[PDB]
Amino acid sequence: ASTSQVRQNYHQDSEAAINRQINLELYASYVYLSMSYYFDRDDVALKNFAKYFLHQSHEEREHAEKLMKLQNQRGGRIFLQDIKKPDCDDWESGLNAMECALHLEKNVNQSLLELHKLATDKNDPHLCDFIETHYLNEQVKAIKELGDHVTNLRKMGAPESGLAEYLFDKHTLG
Amino acid sequence: ASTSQVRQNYHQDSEAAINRQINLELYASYVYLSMSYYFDRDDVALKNFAKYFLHQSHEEREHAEKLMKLQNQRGGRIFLQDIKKPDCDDWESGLNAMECALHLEKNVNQSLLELHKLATDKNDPHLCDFIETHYLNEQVKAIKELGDHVTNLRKMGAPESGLAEYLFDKHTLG
Amino acid sequence: ASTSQVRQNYHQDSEAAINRQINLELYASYVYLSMSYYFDRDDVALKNFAKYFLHQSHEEREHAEKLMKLQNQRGGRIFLQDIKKPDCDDWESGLNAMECALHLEKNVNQSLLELHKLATDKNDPHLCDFIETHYLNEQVKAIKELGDHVTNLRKMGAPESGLAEYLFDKHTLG
Amino acid sequence: ASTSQVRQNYHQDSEAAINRQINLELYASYVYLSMSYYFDRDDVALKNFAKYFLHQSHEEREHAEKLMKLQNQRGGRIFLQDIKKPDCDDWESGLNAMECALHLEKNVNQSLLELHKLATDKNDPHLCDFIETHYLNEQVKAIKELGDHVTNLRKMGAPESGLAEYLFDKHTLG
Amino acid sequence: ASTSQVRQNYHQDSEAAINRQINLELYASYVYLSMSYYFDRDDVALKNFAKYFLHQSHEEREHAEKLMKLQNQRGGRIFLQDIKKPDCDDWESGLNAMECALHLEKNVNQSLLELHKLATDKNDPHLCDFIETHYLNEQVKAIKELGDHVTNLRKMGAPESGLAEYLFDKHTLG
Amino acid sequence: ASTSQVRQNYHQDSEAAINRQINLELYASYVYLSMSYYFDRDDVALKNFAKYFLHQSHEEREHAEKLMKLQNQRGGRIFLQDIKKPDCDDWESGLNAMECALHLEKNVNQSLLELHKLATDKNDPHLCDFIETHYLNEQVKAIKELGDHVTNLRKMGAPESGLAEYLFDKHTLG
Ligand SMILES: [Cl-]
Ligand SMILES: [Cl-]
Ligand SMILES: [Cl-]
Ligand SMILES: [Cl-]
Ligand SMILES: [Cl-]
Ligand SMILES: [Cl-]
Ligand SMILES: [Cl-]
Ligand SMILES: [Cl-]
Ligand SMILES: [Cl-]
Ligand SMILES: [Cl-]
Ligand SMILES: [Cl-]
Ligand SMILES: [Cl-]
Ligand SMILES: [Cl-]
Ligand SMILES: [Cl-]
Ligand SMILES: [Cl-]
Ligand SMILES: [Cl-]
Ligand SMILES: [Cl-]
Ligand SMILES: [Cl-]
Ligand SMILES: [Cl-]
Ligand SMILES: [Cl-]
Ligand SMILES: [Cl-]
Ligand SMILES: [Cl-]
Ligand SMILES: [Cl-]
Ligand SMILES: [Cl-]
Ligand SMILES: [Cl-]
Ligand SMILES: [Cl-]
Ligand SMILES: [Cl-]
Ligand SMILES: [Cl-]
Ligand SMILES: [Cl-]
Ligand SMILES: [Cl-]
Ligand SMILES: [Cl-]
Ligand SMILES: [Cl-]
Ligand SMILES: [Cl-]
Ligand SMILES: [Cl-]
Ligand SMILES: [Cl-]
Ligand SMILES: [Cl-]
Ligand SMILES: [Cl-]
Ligand SMILES: [Cl-]
Ligand SMILES: [Cl-]
Ligand SMILES: [Cl-]
Ligand SMILES: [Cl-]
Ligand SMILES: [Cl-]
Ligand SMILES: [Cl-]
Ligand SMILES: [Cl-]
Ligand SMILES: [Cl-]
Ligand SMILES: [Cl-]
Ligand SMILES: [Cl-]
Ligand SMILES: [Cl-]
Ligand SMILES: [Cl-]
Ligand SMILES: [Cl-]
Ligand SMILES: [Fe+3]
Ligand SMILES: [Fe+3]
Ligand SMILES: [Fe+3]
Ligand SMILES: [Fe+3]
Ligand SMILES: [Fe+3]
Ligand SMILES: [Fe+3]
Ligand SMILES: [Mg+2]
Ligand SMILES: [Mg+2]
Ligand SMILES: [Mg+2]
Ligand SMILES: [Mg+2]
Ligand SMILES: [Mg+2]
Ligand SMILES: [Mg+2]
Ligand SMILES: [Mg+2]
Ligand SMILES: [Mg+2]
Ligand SMILES: [Mg+2]
Ligand SMILES: [Mg+2]
Ligand SMILES: [Mg+2]
Ligand SMILES: [Mg+2]
Ligand SMILES: [Mg+2]
Ligand SMILES: [Mg+2]
Ligand SMILES: [Mg+2]
Ligand SMILES: [Mg+2]
Ligand SMILES: [Mg+2]
Ligand SMILES: [Mg+2]
Ligand SMILES: [Mg+2]
Ligand SMILES: [Mg+2]
Ligand SMILES: [Mg+2]
Ligand SMILES: [Mg+2]
Ligand SMILES: [Mg+2]
Ligand SMILES: [Mg+2]
Ligand SMILES: [Mg+2]
Ligand SMILES: [Mg+2]
Ligand SMILES: [Mg+2]
Ligand SMILES: [Mg+2]
Ligand SMILES: [Mg+2]
Ligand SMILES: [Mg+2]
Ligand SMILES: [Mg+2]
Ligand SMILES: [Mg+2]
Ligand SMILES: [Mg+2]
Ligand SMILES: [Mg+2]
Ligand SMILES: [Mg+2]
Ligand SMILES: [Mg+2]
Ligand SMILES: [Mg+2]
Ligand SMILES: [Mg+2]
Ligand SMILES: [Mg+2]
Ligand SMILES: [Mg+2]
Ligand SMILES: [Mg+2]
Ligand SMILES: [Mg+2]
Ligand SMILES: [Mg+2]
Ligand SMILES: [Mg+2]
Ligand SMILES: [Mg+2]
Ligand SMILES: [Mg+2]
Ligand SMILES: [Mg+2]
Ligand SMILES: [Mg+2]
Ligand SMILES: [Mg+2]
Ligand SMILES: [Mg+2]
Ligand SMILES: [Mg+2]
Ligand SMILES: [Mg+2]
């Protein structure tokens, strides 16, 4: 029950919001793992889509680990929950997967912006700086990259053009 | 519905048993992630326990990825489920965590032995060879290592001796 | 007539089944040699299809040589038969050749699975291990690769699109 | 039916004679493969005889591939036939195998000389030059080498002397 | 009395069969040590026979050590017995020693095949894989090598020809 | 029956005493092999004790081989006997194993001193020099090292202190 010897200026609500964000990052890791192996199917067979999303999956696990480290640095206590299976429809196509990833990374961003508003409301400048330094620009860059990919696939003629997704796989993802 | 162009000698029951094993490997990854950050707490502070279990966590993710690759190689279809939160009590001590890891790795082994018995019953020698080559000896070595660690911690006087867990952290895990 | 000084636990039926497999591997070598030089024709002119199938042809010769080595290791006697000319229709297109190779590599796999069932029935664990180690996963990987190639050529618009086969030749086979 | 865009000065009879030579080179490859694994038997056990004939086997496959390349260069169409199993008696001894190889390489030479006489009769100087450059001196050197080997084995006391074949294996073939 | 914390799917009969195999491997080590120093006698004086059998002796000790490691990995308990002195007649000649080694390595193989049949009967796929991976192909290669050596010594004129054994010592064993 | 051409000043009693010493060195090798794998058990788990005694085991085999070489150098005839299984009680602890090794190495020394007294009585200065050069100081150093190890384990609180044996394993044996 009694207080961590390190804890200072770290609100219980911030502690709980960090636990929720840990779960969301692990969920995002799981979504990208599912998307990766869709592209490894013999009836999809886009190997650079598969490698792109597997790298994105490993990056989300790193994002979760850094928040776990933060929770202990500040003297909070990690509380884990089930990692839900990916909730998105049939992956369908390279374009549809990229659109689902864009939606995922905007939802993660909205969670981080809510977390920053809480840390601001609780006058926790260390936590605000942590979120800004390690998360907010990463999300802005991830969202911009996924928007660019969606735009190129649309302009090339995906998802009806299997030639489009094949050539995008080689020239952008390769 | 209709059959993968690659599928040959791969029973629906084997396909489903591989999906169950994927989930178990992801669960084991999650248990070791939880155990790792327990040792990173300021009131536990055993950094080489933390690094040992984080490495074990990354190895279980690799184990899951290789089964996902196998499912697609054989023309089965990956089906994911929720990854349950770790089910073990309060982690308590270095000795208790090592005993929980031993129990986890014996349960994983029992699942793999059931999977091998199914593959044998369905006359699937490729799947039997896959399990033998990539999983069964890894489990035997993991179980032996964890037994050795439990034995040393017990002999040194854990968990009552905090000096025991400290010196094990430096000399065996360091 | 009298028995090889090395022979032990090696059934006459296994000896004969190995001779049949030697012939099948040499036949597969011959099919891929024919397919390779089809793509070297001035009215087909896909040089990386030609190199891919010539490499596959040399690999099948290696597969045959290793079974010849096994026959002598176990004290059986090699018996050769005619290598039949390739039995497949006009090669027609890059897609049709890839579909014929997929069919060839699944027929070779079925022969190896029958050979493994015989070795299992005759309690020959050395022969079972030989087939598992050197043949079964090679076939699974070959079949998965050819399925992936067929899928990409179909999605790109082959065989009606000569642009599809040209670009596949450069980006996947090159 | 209609004519290759590359074809010039290439008679239908030359085209057919090249297809026959392709088959003969593949047959020679097969004879030397059989001879090689005879020397790998546990009751023959002459490892450098085995390696010598396996190298000769790979060289005949190269000889066949170069004629396949020539057929396409000139705008003819490859037509394959069954590769007959080796027609020679029991291999018996190192000396007998070397005498069978000498007979094989003289029969191949006679085929090439007939092919050159046809190319001369059809005023095809490119084909005459191809045969001279890549085949005729290779055959003369192969025949001379095999004659030398037969002579040494005879002088040493083969095939009655197993010591002769053993020492030839180490000093000439090693 | 009570059970090893590591033991899983490891039958008491398999445990005892592994102890018997340990003894057999140490016995084989001892036979080859005796054979080695026979060839080091001043009235035999074949130094490369001596080095060949001493290497074979050290390899059998490694074979025994790996089974001791396996027994502990699986949570069985090593039980040692006397290592009997070599049971073979006067070593007599290089040919006779090679024939005794062939007989030794076929008896070791038969023991391993019985051990594999037991592990199969007890549904122990880890133990089956261990025997296949580390022992069965090693025995097949050892038996084939010794058959080849016996064949060459016989063909050269051993054991009546001391020149045969001398030249085999230099060219095959050197 | 008749005399080795090399034999000079080598008494039949010395020849027999060397055969007895060969057996004792092989016995010592076997004792240390048993002790090594005791420390590899999952319920003992002292890896540097295991490596120390395995090295000691390989050194005793070298000691036996050098005496076998000596027997042939002097024109005696090696006569082997069964290698008895280790005769020591349950190994129990690191301290008890070290005390058993001290007792083993003093018994080996006493045998060598008896062998030297015989060689002195038979006026065999070559054999006296061989024993002095290759055995007597090795035994003195081995006995002193084992006494030092026993002393440290006793002073640290073994065998009741499992922490003592653990820390000795890392700092002296590591
Ligand atoms: Cl606070
Ligand atoms: Cl608070
Ligand atoms: Cl939960
Ligand atoms: Cl829900
Ligand atoms: Cl603030
Ligand atoms: Cl950034
Ligand atoms: Cl930026
Ligand atoms: Cl950007
Ligand atoms: Cl199927
Ligand atoms: Cl099914
Ligand atoms: Cl679910
Ligand atoms: Cl539940
Ligand atoms: Cl099976
Ligand atoms: Cl392994
Ligand atoms: Cl291992
Ligand atoms: Cl281990
Ligand atoms: Cl048999
Ligand atoms: Cl039979
Ligand atoms: Cl035939
Ligand atoms: Cl037919
Ligand atoms: Cl079997
Ligand atoms: Cl493989
Ligand atoms: Cl693989
Ligand atoms: Cl693959
Ligand atoms: Cl023309
Ligand atoms: Cl014409
Ligand atoms: Cl035909
Ligand atoms: Cl015919
Ligand atoms: Cl002309
Ligand atoms: Cl030339
Ligand atoms: Cl020349
Ligand atoms: Cl010449
Ligand atoms: Cl058990
Ligand atoms: Cl039992
Ligand atoms: Cl006994
Ligand atoms: Cl007895
Ligand atoms: Cl089994
Ligand atoms: Cl092997
Ligand atoms: Cl092999
Ligand atoms: Cl071999
Ligand atoms: Cl010579
Ligand atoms: Cl004397
Ligand atoms: Cl005397
Ligand atoms: Cl005895
Ligand atoms: Cl007794
Ligand atoms: Cl003296
Ligand atoms: Cl010394
Ligand atoms: Cl000294
Ligand atoms: Cl000293
Ligand atoms: Cl210390
Ligand atoms: Fe993230
Ligand atoms: Fe795992
Ligand atoms: Fe093949
Ligand atoms: Fe040729
Ligand atoms: Fe062995
Ligand atoms: Fe010694
Ligand atoms: Mg959430
Ligand atoms: Mg990302
Ligand atoms: Mg709290
Ligand atoms: Mg749900
Ligand atoms: Mg979506
Ligand atoms: Mg800032
Ligand atoms: Mg920044
Ligand atoms: Mg960062
Ligand atoms: Mg930045
Ligand atoms: Mg489950
Ligand atoms: Mg592990
Ligand atoms: Mg299905
Ligand atoms: Mg729950
Ligand atoms: Mg637990
Ligand atoms: Mg098996
Ligand atoms: Mg295997
Ligand atoms: Mg293995
Ligand atoms: Mg592995
Ligand atoms: Mg292994
Ligand atoms: Mg057939
Ligand atoms: Mg292939
Ligand atoms: Mg037969
Ligand atoms: Mg026909
Ligand atoms: Mg076809
Ligand atoms: Mg394998
Ligand atoms: Mg291979
Ligand atoms: Mg493999
Ligand atoms: Mg012909
Ligand atoms: Mg040649
Ligand atoms: Mg025509
Ligand atoms: Mg015929
Ligand atoms: Mg002939
Ligand atoms: Mg020239
Ligand atoms: Mg040339
Ligand atoms: Mg020339
Ligand atoms: Mg026995
Ligand atoms: Mg050996
Ligand atoms: Mg017991
Ligand atoms: Mg006896
Ligand atoms: Mg014998
Ligand atoms: Mg192997
Ligand atoms: Mg090995
Ligand atoms: Mg092997
Ligand atoms: Mg004695
Ligand atoms: Mg020593
Ligand atoms: Mg005597
Ligand atoms: Mg006794
Ligand atoms: Mg004792
Ligand atoms: Mg003196
Ligand atoms: Mg000295
Ligand atoms: Mg020395
Ligand atoms: Mg000295």
PDB file of N, CA and C in Angstrom, chain D residues 124-151:
ATOM      1  N   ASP D 124      27.193 -24.288 -93.587  1.00  0.00           N
ATOM      2  CA  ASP D 124      26.874 -23.560 -92.337  1.00  0.00           C
ATOM      3  C   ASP D 124      28.173 -23.352 -91.587  1.00  0.00           C
ATOM      4  N   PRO D 125      28.944 -22.303 -91.937  1.00  0.00           N
ATOM      5  CA  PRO D 125      30.256 -22.113 -91.291  1.00  0.00           C
ATOM      6  C   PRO D 125      30.180 -21.727 -89.817  1.00  0.00           C
ATOM      7  N   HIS D 126      29.101 -21.052 -89.413  1.00  0.00           N
ATOM      8  CA  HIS D 126      28.936 -20.758 -87.973  1.00  0.00           C
ATOM      9  C   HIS D 126      28.842 -22.056 -87.203  1.00  0.00           C
ATOM     10  N   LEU D 127      28.066 -23.012 -87.682  1.00  0.00           N
ATOM     11  CA  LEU D 127      27.878 -24.280 -86.952  1.00  0.00           C
ATOM     12  C   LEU D 127      29.156 -25.087 -86.989  1.00  0.00           C
ATOM     13  N   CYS D 128      29.847 -25.121 -88.128  1.00  0.00           N
ATOM     14  CA  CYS D 128      31.146 -25.813 -88.209  1.00  0.00           C
ATOM     15  C   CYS D 128      32.100 -25.225 -87.147  1.00  0.00           C
ATOM     16  N   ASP D 129      32.207 -23.917 -87.067  1.00  0.00           N
ATOM     17  CA  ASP D 129      33.093 -23.233 -86.101  1.00  0.00           C
ATOM     18  C   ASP D 129      32.657 -23.553 -84.676  1.00  0.00           C
ATOM     19  N   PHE D 130      31.365 -23.594 -84.404  1.00  0.00           N
ATOM     20  CA  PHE D 130      30.876 -23.910 -83.057  1.00  0.00           C
ATOM     21  C   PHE D 130      31.349 -25.290 -82.657  1.00  0.00           C
ATOM     22  N   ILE D 131      31.190 -26.269 -83.529  1.00  0.00           N
ATOM     23  CA  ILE D 131      31.566 -27.668 -83.225  1.00  0.00           C
ATOM     24  C   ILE D 131      33.071 -27.771 -83.019  1.00  0.00           C
ATOM     25  N   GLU D 132      33.833 -27.157 -83.909  1.00  0.00           N
ATOM     26  CA  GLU D 132      35.318 -27.165 -83.816  1.00  0.00           C
ATOM     27  C   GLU D 132      35.746 -26.510 -82.507  1.00  0.00           C
ATOM     28  N   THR D 133      35.226 -25.322 -82.213  1.00  0.00           N
ATOM     29  CA  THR D 133      35.695 -24.510 -81.053  1.00  0.00           C
ATOM     30  C   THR D 133      35.366 -25.199 -79.731  1.00  0.00           C
ATOM     31  N   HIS D 134      34.151 -25.698 -79.561  1.00  0.00           N
ATOM     32  CA  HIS D 134      33.646 -26.115 -78.246  1.00  0.00           C
ATOM     33  C   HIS D 134      33.623 -27.623 -78.084  1.00  0.00           C
ATOM     34  N   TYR D 135      33.768 -28.429 -79.152  1.00  0.00           N
ATOM     35  CA  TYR D 135      33.565 -29.889 -78.999  1.00  0.00           C
ATOM     36  C   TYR D 135      34.753 -30.701 -79.525  1.00  0.00           C
ATOM     37  N   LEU D 136      35.288 -30.421 -80.718  1.00  0.00           N
ATOM     38  CA  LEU D 136      36.165 -31.447 -81.340  1.00  0.00           C
ATOM     39  C   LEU D 136      37.469 -31.609 -80.557  1.00  0.00           C
ATOM     40  N   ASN D 137      38.100 -30.526 -80.116  1.00  0.00           N
ATOM     41  CA  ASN D 137      39.385 -30.680 -79.404  1.00  0.00           C
ATOM     42  C   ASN D 137      39.098 -31.209 -78.003  1.00  0.00           C
ATOM     43  N   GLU D 138      37.973 -30.804 -77.397  1.00  0.00           N
ATOM     44  CA  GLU D 138      37.606 -31.394 -76.083  1.00  0.00           C
ATOM     45  C   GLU D 138      37.548 -32.922 -76.217  1.00  0.00           C
ATOM     46  N   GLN D 139      36.920 -33.457 -77.270  1.00  0.00           N
ATOM     47  CA  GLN D 139      36.825 -34.918 -77.446  1.00  0.00           C
ATOM     48  C   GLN D 139      38.210 -35.537 -77.634  1.00  0.00           C
ATOM     49  N   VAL D 140      39.058 -34.907 -78.450  1.00  0.00           N
ATOM     50  CA  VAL D 140      40.413 -35.426 -78.716  1.00  0.00           C
ATOM     51  C   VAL D 140      41.167 -35.485 -77.388  1.00  0.00           C
ATOM     52  N   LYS D 141      41.078 -34.436 -76.570  1.00  0.00           N
ATOM     53  CA  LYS D 141      41.784 -34.457 -75.286  1.00  0.00           C
ATOM     54  C   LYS D 141      41.182 -35.513 -74.350  1.00  0.00           C
ATOM     55  N   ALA D 142      39.849 -35.642 -74.293  1.00  0.00           N
ATOM     56  CA  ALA D 142      39.191 -36.636 -73.426  1.00  0.00           C
ATOM     57  C   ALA D 142      39.598 -38.044 -73.801  1.00  0.00           C
ATOM     58  N   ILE D 143      39.620 -38.345 -75.097  1.00  0.00           N
ATOM     59  CA  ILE D 143      39.978 -39.686 -75.623  1.00  0.00           C
ATOM     60  C   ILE D 143      41.436 -39.999 -75.306  1.00  0.00           C
ATOM     61  N   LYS D 144      42.300 -39.022 -75.477  1.00  0.00           N
ATOM     62  CA  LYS D 144      43.749 -39.236 -75.202  1.00  0.00           C
ATOM     63  C   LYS D 144      43.940 -39.521 -73.688  1.00  0.00           C
ATOM     64  N   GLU D 145      43.265 -38.767 -72.844  1.00  0.00           N
ATOM     65  CA  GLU D 145      43.368 -38.941 -71.363  1.00  0.00           C
ATOM     66  C   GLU D 145      42.878 -40.314 -70.975  1.00  0.00           C
ATOM     67  N   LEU D 146      41.752 -40.740 -71.508  1.00  0.00           N
ATOM     68  CA  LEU D 146      41.207 -42.056 -71.158  1.00  0.00           C
ATOM     69  C   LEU D 146      42.105 -43.168 -71.703  1.00  0.00           C
ATOM     70  N   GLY D 147      42.675 -43.005 -72.911  1.00  0.00           N
ATOM     71  CA  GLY D 147      43.629 -43.991 -73.410  1.00  0.00           C
ATOM     72  C   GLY D 147      44.825 -44.095 -72.461  1.00  0.00           C
ATOM     73  N   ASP D 148      45.329 -42.940 -72.051  1.00  0.00           N
ATOM     74  CA  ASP D 148      46.478 -42.953 -71.105  1.00  0.00           C
ATOM     75  C   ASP D 148      46.101 -43.709 -69.832  1.00  0.00           C
ATOM     76  N   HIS D 149      44.917 -43.452 -69.268  1.00  0.00           N
ATOM     77  CA  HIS D 149      44.490 -44.127 -68.023  1.00  0.00           C
ATOM     78  C   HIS D 149      44.390 -45.626 -68.244  1.00  0.00           C
ATOM     79  N   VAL D 150      43.711 -46.060 -69.332  1.00  0.00           N
ATOM     80  CA  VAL D 150      43.617 -47.498 -69.646  1.00  0.00           C
ATOM     81  C   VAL D 150      45.015 -48.112 -69.727  1.00  0.00           C
ATOM     82  N   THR D 151      45.942 -47.470 -70.427  1.00  0.00           N
ATOM     83  CA  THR D 151      47.305 -47.987 -70.593  1.00  0.00           C
ATOM     84  C   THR D 151      47.963 -48.159 -69.230  1.00  0.00           C
TER      85      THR D 151
END
